[PDB]
Design an enzyme around this catalytic site. Structure first.
Site, PDB file in Angstrom:
ATOM      1  N   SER D 159       0.803  -1.214   0.000  1.00  0.00           N
ATOM      2  CA  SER D 159       0.000   0.000   0.000  1.00  0.00           C
ATOM      3  C   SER D 159       0.844   1.275   0.000  1.00  0.00           C
ATOM      4  O   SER D 159       1.491   1.576  -1.010  1.00  0.00           O
ATOM      5  CB  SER D 159      -0.957  -0.041   1.184  1.00  0.00           C
ATOM      6  OG  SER D 159      -2.073   0.761   0.884  1.00  0.00           O
ATOM      7  N   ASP D 251     -10.124  -3.999  -4.148  1.00  0.00           N
ATOM      8  CA  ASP D 251      -9.394  -2.880  -3.556  1.00  0.00           C
ATOM      9  C   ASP D 251      -9.871  -1.558  -4.160  1.00  0.00           C
ATOM     10  O   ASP D 251      -9.886  -1.418  -5.386  1.00  0.00           O
ATOM     11  CB  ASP D 251      -7.898  -3.063  -3.799  1.00  0.00           C
ATOM     12  CG  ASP D 251      -7.044  -2.146  -2.973  1.00  0.00           C
ATOM     13  OD1 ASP D 251      -7.520  -1.060  -2.579  1.00  0.00           O
ATOM     14  OD2 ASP D 251      -5.867  -2.507  -2.734  1.00  0.00           O
ATOM     15  N   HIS D 281      -7.777  -5.239  -0.285  1.00  0.00           N
ATOM     16  CA  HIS D 281      -6.635  -4.544   0.289  1.00  0.00           C
ATOM     17  C   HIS D 281      -6.206  -5.179   1.617  1.00  0.00           C
ATOM     18  O   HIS D 281      -7.044  -5.709   2.353  1.00  0.00           O
ATOM     19  CB  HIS D 281      -7.003  -3.074   0.478  1.00  0.00           C
ATOM     20  CG  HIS D 281      -5.828  -2.166   0.639  1.00  0.00           C
ATOM     21  ND1 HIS D 281      -5.161  -1.616  -0.434  1.00  0.00           N
ATOM     22  CD2 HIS D 281      -5.204  -1.707   1.748  1.00  0.00           C
ATOM     23  CE1 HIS D 281      -4.183  -0.848   0.006  1.00  0.00           C
ATOM     24  NE2 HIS D 281      -4.185  -0.887   1.328  1.00  0.00           N
TER      25      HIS D 281
HETATM   26  C1  LIG Z   1      -7.568   0.726   8.842  1.00  0.00           C
HETATM   27  C2  LIG Z   1      -7.254  -0.314   7.785  1.00  0.00           C
HETATM   28  C3  LIG Z   1      -6.915   0.357   6.461  1.00  0.00           C
HETATM   29  C4  LIG Z   1      -5.729   1.307   6.612  1.00  0.00           C
HETATM   30  C5  LIG Z   1      -4.365   0.631   6.447  1.00  0.00           C
HETATM   31  C6  LIG Z   1      -4.062   0.309   4.996  1.00  0.00           C
HETATM   32  O1  LIG Z   1      -4.895  -0.258   4.313  1.00  0.00           O
HETATM   33  O2  LIG Z   1      -2.785   0.653   4.375  1.00  0.00           O
HETATM   34  C7  LIG Z   1      -2.760   1.673   3.463  1.00  0.00           C
HETATM   35  C8  LIG Z   1      -1.577   2.333   3.210  1.00  0.00           C
HETATM   36  C9  LIG Z   1      -1.556   3.375   2.283  1.00  0.00           C
HETATM   37  C10 LIG Z   1      -2.695   3.765   1.609  1.00  0.00           C
HETATM   38  N1  LIG Z   1      -2.626   4.821   0.708  1.00  0.00           N
HETATM   39  O3  LIG Z   1      -1.532   5.248   0.336  1.00  0.00           O
HETATM   40  O4  LIG Z   1      -3.838   5.385   0.290  1.00  0.00           O
HETATM   41  C11 LIG Z   1      -3.892   3.103   1.849  1.00  0.00           C
HETATM   42  C12 LIG Z   1      -3.909   2.058   2.776  1.00  0.00           C
END
Ligand SMILES: CCCCCC(=O)Oc1ccc([N+](=O)[O-])cc1
Ligand SMILES: CCCCCC(=O)Oc1ccc([N+](=O)[O-])cc1
Ligand SMILES: CCCCCC(=O)Oc1ccc([N+](=O)[O-])cc1
Ligand SMILES: CCCCCC(=O)Oc1ccc([N+](=O)[O-])cc1
Ligand SMILES: CCCCCC(=O)O
Lengths: 309, 309, 309, 309
Positions: D159, D251, D281
């Site tokens: 991510s 996702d 995700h």
């Molecule tokens: C609370 C669970 C979901 C948040 C944690 C996660 O799902 O890790 C991420 C890291 C980065 C991004 N981004 O850059 O939008 C989105 C999500």
């Protein structure tokens, strides 16, 4: 100037020294014979195998000649590779791609069935597709003449045979054979129309496959530009099987392969895209004249084993 | 084992590794195509010349296609080289020996006219001879279409073309053309029947030209064993023109060239005999793959200049 | 009637008109003096050269007188010509062939060393050969007294000297001198026994060299018929150096030179065979009485330059 | 009704039943502890490894904490994996992704160095990128304290860490570290801005990562929309290293990963694109709650081994 491997460049310089007639300037028999001679001198020799056997199966126009390759005299049920040779749908046969088929059978340790499909101009589009589809369905039915059971099929082919690979996978996707397509391997395929592409202009002359030959093949085959059996970029990619797309950085139809892999990603399908650097179209069949292309084929083999799991 | 040059041996090892079929096992057009590819890929590129021009002259069967090579756009009267390609009277054409022709024209600074004579099996013996003789007489007549006045002619050719060289010189010796043969250059010629010779047994396999190929050619051409137009060792040597015989030490028909040069000496005729050491039949057309053979050709050229004065 | 040039025929008629005695009728001193007189009369005048210098070298029976000819007082390293005069191993010396030596040195622009070898019957076979061999090895060692460096040697000689030329090349071939024999030029040599030859019968009388003289020389020299140093056709030809054999069409020992050239071809050796038409034995030394024989010598010179590269 | 695996759907429905607060409704410390607790419950336990060792390296704002994972105390030189955790650049640390790191080290038999980069909102863009880049360069220098030699580096991250993976590869591409990036593995990366994508609307709620959280992370991190270090789809792809892009079919930022893989194909770069079917995700860190996601991780591993050769 684009990057060319030294052994690749030496081969291109010899072709330039030869400076033969174009395909259109030869008779059809001469054009086909020159392709036999090119692969005969340029490719590595055939592997020894336990089984190399000529067969045939029924087709819409008559019987379709086939050749079975297997490193094992007897084997259990598993996927069967169904191979379609290149040559623009105009030239090539079971012998021009024989050594490559023995190599695929040896390195994959899977059976390979090559299809001797009908050629243009005598049999225009979609004759080649009709025969490749019928033969692939036949293999997928585990006939007794084949002597080994298919749990799935793996369409593979170079160039026009890479076009056939994708078309066959789409046709069987829409109307399944007795087993599914578990993997397809289009090698420097024609998927979108190459006319107007940047690779076609950049590599129009001097890179084995020429713009003149592409036009010669196109005129003989007569594929309709709106027909997804002629240009399978136009087909439905949403259920495409796992795919390995292999291209060459110096290929005039390189961008056609780029287009197809991009369309598979766009549809969310699993795909390995490999663009071999510093080599041309036909690299799978020049593995003695250009020794570094053996390594390029071995990368495709490794990708295939990975994707078969 | 016999002496082989290192670059020559590497070429033979490449051929052995390829492990191709015999000429007889191919289709006729595939056999022709394999020769195009052999010379095309192994010879040096063509020289740039002022004049490379396709023409034709009348022959007993119809028109005979010709190709004129000249480093000069215009030139005064002088000798004209008339060239007959090798290939057993079955294969080869104007393109298989085109690069060698440009080299002869460049290094001699004389015009070269190559003859696209009729081939067996379609046109058996003596069709090739008829066409070579007719073309040479036509050149010797200084036709306006050629644009080069001939003071004399120089028949030259490799292998079957070396056979034709000697036959043409004998035919023109007996019934003169408009100008004389001032020099003939049979290069690894077939002059006597090779059957039974020591060189045929010693070099029957593995030296480019094989016994099997010699037999394939003989079956297609059908030369009469008693006819000096087939085997010009049987002809009258007492007025033979000045001659350069070039052979290869590893040639199965080497002893046929030795026989001819000995017959010339026996008849009191002037002859340069050159036997190239450690190279094979066809050394004139493999000058890129086996770089030392360029020097062999250059020795022939030096002998030609000497014998012309 | 064999072909005879008009200038050659007139010289033969003048000889017949003068009607001198045979070699057997004369005293040894008279026979040697008549040879001096014939060449002094018949040959073209000596060339002016920077260097005409008497030398000597150690031999197996005492010192061997030599004469060095060079158009240059000082020169770069290069081949050195080693010359052995004709005269049956009985007559001739450094003066009988002096003008010819100056002509060879002038036209080749190479140094020439003539050998004053021991003569029969005072010194029978193998005396002449021992001295010719020793002198050639000495020249090949680039001794200080020679005044120029030899990169190779070129044995050359007429008739008995042509016999010596071949024998010397064979002896140095078996046991090399400090530099190789790069070319040999036997001129109307005695290589095989002339007894029984068709040329000996055809030209036994009236062609400068007679059957009577040949027998006279043979009785004096007493060469062993089985010894290759007497008759080098019997020697090992498989490594013979590059060779120019020159004969004359009216020579009683013509067929001896034909035999040798044929044996070289049979052994696969490079050889130029030149048979001068319509002239006799001794044509290299009658270049004023028969003016066209200068052109014959010049053809040998041209062949020598070509064969040296 | 998009396809959802049964074990995946059960996990989503339990999350729905808990009906917990959004990231905006929690304090920063509550949000971070909430993420620690989710992965603590949902992921498989840590693998036992010979080496799990805290290290540190100099950074642009002080020491960067690192954690080294290795199944071997002592190993040959080889690639070193450099890992950047997910969590929007706001949450996550060395512990939230610890078990996944031990799994990658165990299954690859390569060392893994995880980076404890600076987090937003305390340290907004580009702080995380600066730290990831510095740590990867440090590892690539094979420092004595690392205890093994790096022949290359393999950036990998989920991510936000997949974003950092691509950005690091671009920065090291423009300014090389001591060894090259030999492979990059962005896992469900943010490469292009998700705003406006079809995936963002289709999966805005109920699929672990929500649109609300994406907006929350975005406001904290404050990445410049025109900066390729914030949105590496904007970077130069022409020399991208070999790449494995893994996405999830449910996702909301799936389409961003599709976009990046398509851009690499368009640039002619080698890429494996894997879109895991019926999972969300964060599938790499929920491998106990959704046991089928262990197989998804194992497919990525198999692709990594294949692409490393
Ligand atoms: C609370 C669970 C979901 C948040 C944690 C996660 O799902 O890790 C991420 C890291 C980065 C991004 N981004 O850059 O939008 C989105 C999500
Ligand atoms: C003589 C050069 C190689 C021509 C054969 C060849 O390269 O195999 C091809 C097959 C199909 C297409 N095509 O579909 O344009 C192009 C090439
Ligand atoms: C395939 C290699 C041999 C191709 C033909 C060739 O090398 O040219 C020849 C021409 C004539 C004869 N012949 O008369 O036997 C032999 C050879
Ligand atoms: C007066 C004419 C004869 C002079 C000698 C001559 O013409 O030179 C010869 C050298 C050697 C041999 N021989 O070896 O038979 C024959 C001839
Ligand atoms: C037939 C054997 C080839 C070499 C023997 C020779 O030169 O006559």
């Amino acid at each position: 100037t684009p990057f060319i491997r030294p052994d690749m460049k030496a081969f291109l310089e010899a072709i330039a020294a030869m400076a033969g007639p174009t395909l259109a300037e030869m008779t059809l028999e001469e054009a086909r014979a020159s392709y036999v001679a090119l692969h005969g001198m340029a490719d590595r020799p055939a592997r020894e195998l336990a089984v190399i056997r000529n067969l045939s199966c029924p087709g819409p126009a008559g019987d379709i000649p086939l050749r079975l390759y297997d490193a094992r005299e007897s084997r259990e049920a598993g996927p069967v590779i169904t191979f379609y040779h290149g040559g623009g749908f105009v030239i090539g046969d079971l012998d021009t791609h024989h050594n490559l088929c023995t190599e695929i059978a040896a390195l994959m340790d899977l059976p390979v069935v090559a299809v001797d499909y009908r050629l243009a101009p005598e049999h225009p589009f979609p004759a080649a597709i009709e025969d490749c589809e019928a033969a692939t369905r036949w293999v997928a039915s585990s006939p007794s003449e084949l002597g080994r059971t298919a749990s799935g099929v793996i369409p593979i082919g170079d160039s026009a045979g890479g076009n056939a690979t994708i078309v066959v996978s789409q046709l069987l996707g829409a109307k399944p054979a007795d087993v599914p397509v578990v993997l397809q391997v289009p090698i420097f395929p024609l998927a979108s129309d190459a006319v107007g592409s940047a690779s076609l202009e950049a590599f129009a002359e001097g890179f084995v496959l020429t713009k003149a030959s592409i036009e010669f093949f196109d005129t003989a085959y007569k594929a309709d530009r709106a027909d997804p059996r002629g240009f399978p970029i136009l087909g439905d990619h949403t259920a495409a099987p796992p795919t390995i797309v292999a291209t060459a950085s110096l290929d005039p139809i390189r961008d056609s392969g780029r287009d197809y892999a991009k369309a598979l990603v766009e549809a969310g399908r699993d795909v390995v895209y490999l663009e071999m650097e510093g080599v041309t179209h036909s690299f799978t069949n020049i593995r003695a004249a250009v020794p570094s292309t053996q390594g390029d084929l071995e990368r495709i083999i490794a990708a295939m084993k990975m994707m078969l799991g």
